[PDB]
Each structure stands twice: as structure tokens, then as C-alpha cells.
Write a protein that binds this ligand. Structure first.
Ligand SMILES: O=C(Cn1c(-c2nccs2)nc2ccccc21)Nc1ccc(Br)cc1
Ligand SMILES: O=C(Cn1c(-c2nccs2)nc2ccccc21)Nc1ccc(Br)cc1
Ligand SMILES: O=c1[nH]cnc2c1ncn2[C@@H]1O[C@H](COP(=O)(O)O)[C@@H](O)[C@H]1O
Ligand SMILES: O=c1[nH]cnc2c1ncn2[C@@H]1O[C@H](COP(=O)(O)O)[C@@H](O)[C@H]1O
Ligand SMILES: O=c1[nH]cnc2c1ncn2[C@@H]1O[C@H](COP(=O)(O)O)[C@@H](O)[C@H]1O
Ligand SMILES: O=c1[nH]cnc2c1ncn2[C@@H]1O[C@H](COP(=O)(O)O)[C@@H](O)[C@H]1O
Lengths: 302, 318, 306, 321
């Protein structure tokens, strides 16, 4: 049968409470971004022109996470954005590249970047793998490759030198892939499939897209991810790369338009709190402890 | 797999009628709150600062149920509220306590409380059990423990001296636990799993949160619960705490979760808002009780014990 | 657990087309209302304060169906309503009674009523069964008994003398039993359950409530029912009880303890024509020349929420 | 729990295509497909046989882009012939024509006009009248015959045996369709294509997925699951090449769109179609390129260089609403 089964998304499930000995404040949110880079919190700001530039990356790094500077600009600009983050405190920083963009990656590495995010709409392709091999042979850096949803995809990327795999075809807030192409796999299932491969190799999984609430972070992690990438939640915050605008009562941020969210610190604080509480309910002091102990129930939309 | 099954809530379910010889009026609503405390009607008012204080507890007790005084006040104030209910006839009351609140527990027991509700967002925890053991070893008192959703939780609480188990993580109009933490089990499935353990030991199940209509009470009880704890339905009534406010045409009263920003003044796990004034709570409780009697008429059950014996339900689509 | 399965409503299913030799215009719609009262179309108007009196029962009867006069009136008044129909061309007519209403039934049978409809919210009662038995012992008439949703309930009523079984607890457009009592069985599942008993004894099933479109009639009949009782579909019509009024260039009349207002639906014939037409089309798709063929040939697919 | 329940029916919105390893860019994808046993197309798109989507201008544009148009039968015989001939005058272009039950005179004239496919169109294709018409045509005329509409294995098997060169699937879908409401009849489209393809692929008879296409993604879903081509009406209604009149209401330009079994369409049985205005979609060529791009993107995700590759490699997941 062509039907491989029932795909489950964030809103379809709820995590089941376990016996607990840990207070939410006692929980350790420390995780691995790649096999050689680690973070204090499992949050990553998306590589979109509407979410992560130098300001956003500085904020994320100071709060224990990491920003990925988007590639939608010239090489010199992206290297500059990376330098600005490194200048103010010597923080953790990442940057995205497309296919065949070897020189871009090279200059980003020399700028001091900690991770290169090899992004594409369909990560399980020839050209993505060729770029991966080419990067690994020409420069010394940890590479995150995406996006994928299947077992074979995850296996082939790890074998070709991937230091982390990014999961997500479909869930993005500004979606078109599900409608234009009719292609995708729901996030919970997508993480589950990819985790069964990656954890045998000890390779971290980044859950990318579809996060609406702090609860979704807990589900994505509990299901097998090591970190979570967020876009829309951070889009519209003061630190996002836009300018403020006024329409009636409400303040907006143009580039494209989304509602102003205020300081990012308040937004990140709530996400962290929600995750701490989640891991409290499930009696897990660490994310690795969460993987071993977590379970969920299917829920009707209602 | 991590998928343990499909969870069902109140709205996903409909009770199947049985052969009936009992009119709604003939129905006995007698039930057990704890191992040693009994109720005339299986209704409890939630331990919340917008639902239950002394007026609510008197109203509940006179109608055959029980009010449980919230813990969002000082010990001296909570004792006084218990003493004010005991001031008018032989009325039964409960009182809520948090983790490691042994002094509050001692004072309420000595204030002549009938039950103590050891209340937690996550009832299956080390802190709860140790607080349970303390009170059970040192005080003569029935203790309801919550909140839980698993069979492992209920068994462990019962073995450590729980006289009643309160079930509910996720349901409740003001609850946002499942949004902010992604945690919960739908209420019917929750009761079902917990009831399978609790009935073996003869320990009553309190179904807490998620009741929107009188038909939900019947569903909770039919599936294995002994009583139902309600908050939102009694929130707007005259007997609930907080003053009344008229905005426009209709009068409003404030309803607030305990894990809400206002109530805490920990990540917020409850919403806050105004709800319409609902008149006297006895008019409200009458409707709920009537619906339960009607429900048990359909299933042909003269008692809740009988209800448990001949209950069945169907799943429904959206 | 206590989960007896998944309950399907009209909106949950679609009928699968079969090989067809019959055009919609050629199919027969003749059915049995009771054990020994038959209709030319499988439509019945609800016994409600707001849908069926003498005018409605006449219109229904002249179209091949039948009207059940509601009980919410004097025995004298209800007998008179039956009288106005019978003398309007020997038309078939039914009348509703409640529990213990033996005398009302007696006078209605004398008035020459064709069917008595023993109405209860819960037909599987001691009081319903003894009312049925007391009617049969004292008078000679076909009795439809309802409402029920289970196979055990259907059997007991048939054993006690029920000539028709009315099915429907929960699905009625104006019903709140699902909300007040939390009780019910979705209409398709309910008809399926009761048919597995009643078809063996040759006792017709009346599908009652939930019919919102003509396509629902087909589903109800296809799944085992002999006829459908329809309420809100016929509520705003000219022939229904109530007066016309204008509220902002729109004509209205009431539908039901107050229970909201409905728009004027015009002449009842046009409404019935569409319903009958839709059912003919359905039976074309399923290649069924008769309702008996429909039962033998029917299959349906479950449909997702979207 | 049955007993007349045969399973859960899946529609376009119920499933998602699972990506595979890809070596193919969207630009390098072959969209060439089989229309009937003997006729083939360069893009797998057909314009519906409706009096509000396809006449000569629509058919010309469709063929000019690698697809085909089916001239609707809601006109007299000589009018339909003239439409077929008007397509023939603007280059050696392929064109189809719709036909109703027992309309043999119509079929002979349409074949004379140089029609490439006869579409024996019916609401219920699995009937005794349709099979009789199929047998009469295939014995009396040299022409490829697409027969619809059907949803079952038995239906498609019987039509193939009686000389159907193509099977058209779809009872239930269609933006303007109310068969589900009026009759309570239908099968969700994914399930319908699956059931019919399982038979038709054994005989190499192309399946036409008819109705229910709202987005370019649906085309991929229909093809991936077993269809050879996709018939569309809704998304072509209101284009510059559609036979309707252009009309300004407020700030937006509108054109009319109606089902063939609607009240207005039957004027010039009970209605099984709704009618309404649709926003002017502009040039048709532009609308098709978006569909083709999304289709290419889809096959790029599944790493399929041709539709034959797509059938062999495609798989999907069920999703909740
Ligand atoms: O305690 C809380 C939140 N919370 C609540 C509730 N939240 C849900 C239901 S009642 N009521 C409160 C009153 C005062 C301050 C916080 C409060 N969350 C939490 C506790 C342990 C664990 Br493990 C995980 C999470
Ligand atoms: O023929 C019709 C209605 N109808 C339709 C369609 N309705 C649905 C899909 S195409 N297109 C028409 C064009 C002209 C006049 C009526 C038309 N229904 C029907 C026919 C046989 C059988 Br068995 C069952 C039902
Ligand atoms: O336009 C798009 N097309 C496809 N994927 C996108 C697009 N925009 C954002 N995404 C993905 O969605 C993620 C952000 O998801 P969000 O947090 O739901 O907004 C990004 O990291 C991208 O991987
Ligand atoms: O703020 C909170 N967050 C989550 N649950 C709460 C909160 N406050 C009260 N509850 C629970 O929700 C129940 C009330 O539910 P309701 O009657 O359906 O509105 C109470 O009995 C509490 O157990
Ligand atoms: O007040 C009510 N409660 C429950 N059922 C009702 C009530 N009123 C009418 N009904 C039933 O519902 C049917 C009408 O449903 P409708 O066709 O969906 O409008 C009638 O035939 C009655 O048997
Ligand atoms: O009036 C009708 N009732 C039901 N289906 C129709 C009617 N008219 C056209 N159709 C079908 O609907 C298809 C168009 O589907 P659409 O592109 O989704 O709007 C056509 O190819 C016809 O097969």
C-alpha cells in the first residue's frame, strides 16, 4: 500500500505525565546542537530575513540559544552580520547557505561561525549531498543539513558527514509546500522517523517549523529532537530584522507584515518556562532522560 | 512505540440508553467522597478563589454536596472560613493544601474539617507523596489527593494512604496546561484508567475539571467516577466570592484560574476573564442534578453503583 | 472498556454507487409504514406542535406520505384534526400519544386513525411496554413505538406487539438530549442496530430526526429504515401550524419552552418534490428499483471531518 | 464496525505525499502522459466539458500548452462540430468532445469533424445505457472513447471490457457538485482513483481524475496515486479563454461558473449543481504555468522524472484536519 500510515502533528498529541522527582527549576535544558556544538537551551531562531539577523543572534546567544543568520543577502553582508555577533562578547553564532555556495560557507567559517546550516526545501537530493561532501573536504566546521522527513534521508546525510539533521517539510507558518506541491510529513511523525536513525549514531535532530506554543517544544523534544527551531514566534519581536509601523491601535513590523511582539526576552522566557514545566510533568531532569521516559496520547481536534 | 492509545474527552462520547424501570425522580444520587465520607449528591465546588469560600461551601453542603475552601489565603483566614461553615448546623467542608503544608493541614483538621485535599498540578510527585505520608501518619483525617491521570499514579497514592483520588490534568475551561506544556490526558480516558485501579481498593474517584454541561456529569460518573468537581459553572453565581459588575446590559462576575497571572500575584498555566452572572447557585445545581437524574433514567440506573455496572458509550465524530 | 464502537451520523458517510439498469424516474418509492399500513412515498411529518396539524397531514397524504398529528392539545381537538383529514378524501392519518394515554388512543382509533404513534424520549421503559400492551388488549390498531437506538430495545417492543419501530434519540435538529443528559446514538448506527432485529420480523423502521437534506433520506433508507420522519425541513411551510409575520422584509414562523424562529419556506409541495427527487436520484446511483433492493444493494464509505 | 461500511474514504486534503531521494530538478521533469490507448499529451491537464469552462478558445489554449480541451454538449450538434472545427483551423491541435447517453448521431458528426477523443459523459457511468452506447460506438466508428464517471473496481472493469479507451473517475468531487448533499452519493477522490487504477493499470487504460482540484498540489496527489491525467473546471472558470461574459461588480471583475446539472444550465431531474460568479482569473496561460510548476515541484520532491516513475515510487501519509 502507498498509505504508510497516519501522520501526527503537534496539535494531534498530548504528553502523558510520569512519576516526578524534579522541580521545573531543577530541570537541565542543556542540549547538543551538533555533535561538537552544544547549547544551554534547545532554542534556535530561524534563518529567515524576517527573524534572524545580528540583533536576534546576540539575543539568542545571551539567553543560551543560537541564531542562524539568513542567506538572503550578499556574502559580505552575511559575514558582517556574523562578525557583529562575534564582536559583542564572542558568542555562539550560525549561518545558512544554499546549494553550491562553497565560498559563502568558507568566508563564514573564517569569520568565526560555529555552525553552517545547509538549507534546502528538499534535503534528500544529489546536489545537497555534493555540497555537503565539498564543504567537509574544503573547510573544518560542523554542518547541519535539511530539510528531511524520512529514514533513508537521515541515514544518507549522516554517512556523508552531517553533524546535525534538520527535520521539516510542511509545517512552516508561511506554508506553500503543502498546498503548491502537496508534499509533506507531519512533524511528530517526521521527528519519530528521523530519530530512529540519528540516535543510533548520536547525531542531534533539529525540529524545524510548526511550533505555535511552548507546549510544541516539549512534544518535539520528547519525540526525539535535540533542539527546536522557531520563526514566527520570534518574528515581530524588537530584535527581529524589521521596522515598526502603525495601523490603528496596533503596531506592526514591515520588511510582509506581522504584529509587534515586544522584547524577545519575554517571549523566550515563556517558552523556557513552558518546557521546564513540561519536563516537570514527565519527571525528566534532562532531555536525554525525556527521550527514555516520554509517552503521548492521540487527541481529537474537538 | 511512544503512542499509548487514543484519548477520549467528554465531547467525543455519548452514553447508550438501557432498559429502564426508574423515573428520574426515583434515582438515588448517594455517593462516596472519600473512604469514610458520604455525599447526598455527587457534586463538589472547585478549590479556587473565584469559586469556593464560606458561602459556596454552605450552599453546597445544604444541597447534599461539599465545598472545598481554596488555599490562596493565609492559614488563619482559611481556618475562619471553615469555622464559619461549621457555625451554621452540621455542614460538611473540605479544605485544600499545597505541598509540605503540614501546619495548614494541622490547623484545618483542628478547625474540624471533614476532608483535606492535597492539591497539585502534577499529583504523581515525590513532594506530594511525602506530604501524604506525613498527614496520614500524624493526623486522623480523610485525604483526597490529586491531580492524576495514570493508573501508576493512583496505585502509588492509594498505597501511601489516599482516601480519594482526584483525576484531571488538562481539562477545565481556564486550563492551559496542554497549550503551555503540551501535557494532558483527555478526561474520559483519564477516569477510565484511574478507575480500573481505584475500584479494586474501594477508593472513590473525583473527576475534576472539564464539565460544561449537566450531561458531562453523567458521563464522568458512568465511566467510573464517584463525584465531580466543578468550577466554571458555579463561578458566576451569587454565592461565589468576588463582587458583581454591570457592563452594558448584563452583569458580569470574575472567573480566574489558580495558575493564572492574577492568582499568582512559575509559568502561567491558566487564563483569566469575566463570566456572566448566573443567579443563585441552587437554581444552577437544580438543573445539573435534573440532567443527571434524566441521564440515569435513560441508562435505567437507580444508583451510581448501578450506573457503573450497566454503562456503555459510543464514540462520535466532531 | 465501555466503548461499544464508533457511532456514525449522516454527515459521516456517503453511499457508494452500484451498477444500474434503472433511471431515477422509474424507481418505486412504495414502502410499509407499519406491519400492515403502507405508503407510496417514505416520508412522514413529525408529531410536533410546530409542524403537523390537519393541513400538513392532508398535504403529506396527497403526496403519498403521511402526517402524524401532535398530542399537544385536547383529546377532542386532536380527534377533530384526524376528522378533518379523513373526510378530505379518505386520507391516511396518524396521531401521537404519550405514556398511559390509553383513552386518547381509544378515541383516536374511533375517529378512524390509521396509526397510533406511542411517543417517548426513551421507548425502552416499563411504562411504554405496558402502555403498548394495554392498547393492544383494548383496541385494534397498528402502533408505532419509539424512540429507541438499541437492538435489545427493538426486540422487546416487537415481542410486546409493536407494529412499527421509531428510531432516534439525539439527532433531532431541535433536540438537546445530547447536552442535558449526555445520552444518544448517532442516527446511521442507530438504524443499523435496530434493523438487524426488525428486518427479521418484517417490522418497518422509522428513521426520526436529523434529516437536513434529501441525501440523508437515502442514507437512512439504505441503511435499513423503511421511512423517515422529518421535522425542521417542513417547519416554515405554508401548511404547517403558526402565523406568518414580517421581520425586515423576510417572512417568518416559529419552530420548536421557547426554541427559536425559522424562515418561511413556501409551499410544502415544492419542498417534498425536491426531497422525493433527490431520493430517486440516489436510488438511481445505487441501481435500486425499490427500497427492498436498496437494502440488499447498499454500501457506504466513511468520510473524514474535512 | 460494518456492516455496509467498506472502509474509510480519503480525499485530497486527507493525505500528503512523502518525499523520496531526488536527482531530478523540477525543470528536468517529463510530464508526457497517455490520454487514451492511442492518444497522448505533453501535460496531464484536461479542461472540463462544461458550458462555462470549455469551448473553442479554451480547447485551443489547452492544446497549445500540451493538454486538451473537451467541448461541452450543452449546445446543438452543428454548434459542437463548429467548435471542433475552429480548433482544427488554428493548427493541427488535439481536441475532445463530450457526449450523452444514446447520442449516436452526435458521435458520428463529431468524428467527422476530426475529434481526437469522444467523452461518453454521465453522472453515473456504470449504467446499462452507457455500456450500450459504448458498444455501439466501438462497432460503428473508428474513435477512442473516454467513459465516465465511475468510482468502483467493478465499474471500471466492465467499461474496459466493453472497449473503453479511457476511464474517467469522479462522483462526489467538484467545487460546484452537490451530489453528496442531494443524493448522499459519492466516493472521496483519492480512494476513488486508487480503486479504479488497481484495475485499469492491469489493462494499461489511462485513468482521468475528474473534479476536486483546488490547488496544484492536488494534481500531484491524483497522478501519484494512479491517474494519468487530471480534468479541471473550477480553476479554469473565469479565465480570459472561458466562454462566459466579462462583468464588473464593485472593484472586482467577475465571470459566471455553473455545474451542468444546475438550474440555469438545465434551462438552456432535481439539480445536482450550484451556480455563482467567480473572480476574473486573467490569462489562462498564466494559470496553467502555476499548476505545471507545482506539479514539477511535486515530482521533484518524489524524485520522479516521469509519471511512470511517479506511480512506481510514490507513497503518502494520512493527516488530520
Ligand atoms: O504549579 C503549577 C502552576 N500552578 C497552578 C496549576 N497549574 C495547573 C493546574 S493548577 N496553580 C498554581 C498556583 C500558584 C502558583 C502556580 C500554580 N504548575 C506545575 C507544577 C508542578 C509541575 Br511538576 C508542573 C507544573
Ligand atoms: O443527470 C444528472 C444531473 N445532471 C448532471 C450531473 N449531475 C451530477 C454529475 S453530472 N449533469 C447534467 C447535465 C444536464 C442535465 C442533468 C445533469 N444526475 C443523475 C443522472 C443519472 C443518475 Br443514475 C443519477 C443522477
Ligand atoms: O517560505 C517558506 N517555504 C518553505 N519553508 C519555509 C518557508 N518559510 C519558512 N520555512 C520553514 O519554516 C521554518 C520556520 O517555521 P515557523 O516557526 O512555523 O515560522 C523555517 O526555519 C523554514 O525551515
Ligand atoms: O490555572 C489553572 N491551570 C490549569 N488548571 C486549573 C487552574 N486553576 C484551576 N484548575 C483546575 O480546573 C478545574 C476547574 O475546571 P472547570 O470547572 O471546567 O472550569 C479546577 O478544579 C482545577 O483543578
Ligand atoms: O424537544 C425535543 N427533544 C428531543 N427530541 C425532539 C424534541 N422535539 C422534537 N423531537 C424529535 O425530533 C424530530 C424532529 O427532528 P428534525 O427533523 O431534525 O427537526 C421529531 O420527529 C421528534 O421526534
Ligand atoms: O452540475 C454538476 N453536478 C455535479 N458534478 C458536476 C456538475 N457539472 C460538472 N460536474 C463535474 O465537475 C467537474 C469539475 O470539477 P471542479 O474543477 O472541481 O469544479 C467536471 O469535470 C464534471 O465532471
Amino acid at each position: 500500500t502507498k498509505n504508510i500510515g497516519k501522520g501526527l502533528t503537534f496539535e494531534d498529541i498530548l504528553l502523558v505525565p510520569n512519576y516526578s522527582e524534579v522541580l521545573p527549576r531543577e530541570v537541565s535544558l542543556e542540549t547538543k546542537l551538533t555533535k561538537n556544538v552544544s547549547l544551554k537551551i534547545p532554542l534556535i531562531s530561524s534563518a529567515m530575513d524576517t527573524v534572524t539577523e545580528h540583533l536576534m543572534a546576540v539575543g539568542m546567544a545571551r539567553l543560551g540559544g543560537i541564531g542562524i543568520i539568513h542567506k538572503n543577502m550578499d556574502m559580505e553582508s552575511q559575514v558582517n552580520e556574523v562578525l557583529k555577533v562575534k564582536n559583542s562578547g564572542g558568542l555562539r553564532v550560525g549561518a545558512a547557505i544554499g546549494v553550491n555556495e562553497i565560498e559563502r560557507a568558507k568566508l563564514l567559517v573564517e569569520a568565526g561561525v560555529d555552525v553552517i546550516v545547509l538549507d534546502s526545501a528538499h534535503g534528500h537530493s544529489l546536489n545537497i549531498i555534493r555540497t555537503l561532501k565539498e564543504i567537509k573536504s574544503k573547510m573544518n566546521i560542523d554542518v547541519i543539513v535539511g530539510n528531511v522527513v524520512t529514514e533513508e534521508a537521515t541515514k544518507e546525510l549522516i554517512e556523508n558527514g552531517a553533524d546535525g539533521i534538520k527535520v521539516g517539510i510542511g509545517p512552516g507558518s508561511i506554508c506553500t509546500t503543502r498546498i503548491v506541491a502537496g508534499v509533506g510529513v507531519p512533524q511528530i511523525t517526521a521527528i519519530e522517523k528521523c530519530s530512529s536513525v540519528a540516535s543510533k549514531f548520536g547525531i542531534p535532530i533539529i525540529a524545524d517549523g510548526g511550533i505555535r506554543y511552548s507546549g510544541d517544544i516539549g512534544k518535539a523534544l520528547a519525540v526525539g529532537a535535540s533542539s527546536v527551531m522557531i520563526g514566527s514566534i520570534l518574528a515581530g519581536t524588537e530584535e527581529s530584522p524589521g521596522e515598526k509601523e502603525l495601523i490603528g491601535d496596533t503596531v506592526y513590523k514591515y520588511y510582509g507584515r506581522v504584529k509587534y511582539k515586544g522584547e524577545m526576552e519575554g517571549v523566550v522566557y515563556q517558552l523556557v518556562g513552558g518546557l521546564r514545566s513540561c519536563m516537570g510533568y514527565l519527571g525528566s531532569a534532562s532531555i536525554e532522560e525525556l527521550w527514555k521516559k516520554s509517552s503521548y496520547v492521540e487527541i481529537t481536534t474537538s
